[PDB]
């Protein structure tokens, strides 16, 4: 589900960004999360919070993931939809 963060099924974290009304038989579009700290456009790489923690949506590393590997929902970023969408738009449209 779009804007929700999951983990995989084996031992780390990502946000599903694909539209819920577009169906991809077994795949799913994702933007992984990197630790925010380590990053010195904050608009192209939005920073999100999950628990008492903050991460960088590594937008340039976007990718498809087989739904079979997708673990538990850890959080829901639906309330950052605009930021997240703007980030995705900034990359293809540059605006």
């Amino acid at each position: 589900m779009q804007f929700k963060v999951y983990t995989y099924k084996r031992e780390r974290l990502f946000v599903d960004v694909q539209s819920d009304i577009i169906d991809t038989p077994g795949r799913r579009m994702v933007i992984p999360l990197a630790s925010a700290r380590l990053l010195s456009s904050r608009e192209l790489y939005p920073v999100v919070h999950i628990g008492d923690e903050s991460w960088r949506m590594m937008t340039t590393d976007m990718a498809s993931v087989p739904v079979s590997v997708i673990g538990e929902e850890v959080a829901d970023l639906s309330h950052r939809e605009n930021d997240i969408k703007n980030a995705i738009n900034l990359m293809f449209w540059g605006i």
């Binding site: 009304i21 169906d23 605009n82």
Partner: protein
């Protein structure tokens, strides 16, 4: 078959967003004015769900409804010749790109919407038999 219901839910969900757009384009001038006066998208979004909109020449297209999601709450949708948008639909209208306002582009929306309306019906006929 689950297979069928899965198909129904999928089309409903899909068409649900396409309606919002059909209604949004049935009254663009007031939508535009609403948006171009909202300080922020967030506010524009609130404004959008807040007040209902005239079912334009899409009124007859909507019209014994089953294109609505099994999960859609009663305070939403067509209720009294007026359409009440969900927060989700408002978003889709805010994400619209200007070029989708052209003539040929307006028609492709109305056409996919109509197709989904046809599939839905066929799907219920299957849940029927």
């Amino acid at each position: 078959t689950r297979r069928t219901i899965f198909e129904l839910r999928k089309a409903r969900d899909r068409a649900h967003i396409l309606e919002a757009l059909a209604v949004a384009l049935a009254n663009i001038d007031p939508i535009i004015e609403l948006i171009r006066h909202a300080p922020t998208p967030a506010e524009a979004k609130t404004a959008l769900v807040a007040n209902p909109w005239q079912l334009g020449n899409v009124a007859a297209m909507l019209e014994d409804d089953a294109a609505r999601p099994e999960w859609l709450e009663p305070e939403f949708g067509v209720r009294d010749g007026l359409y009440y948008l969900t927060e989700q639909q408002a978003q889709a209208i805010l994400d619209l790109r200007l070029q989708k306002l052209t003539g040929l582009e307006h028609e492709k929306l109305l056409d996919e919407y109509k197709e989904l309306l046809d599939q839905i019906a066929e799907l219920l006929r299957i849940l029927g038999s």
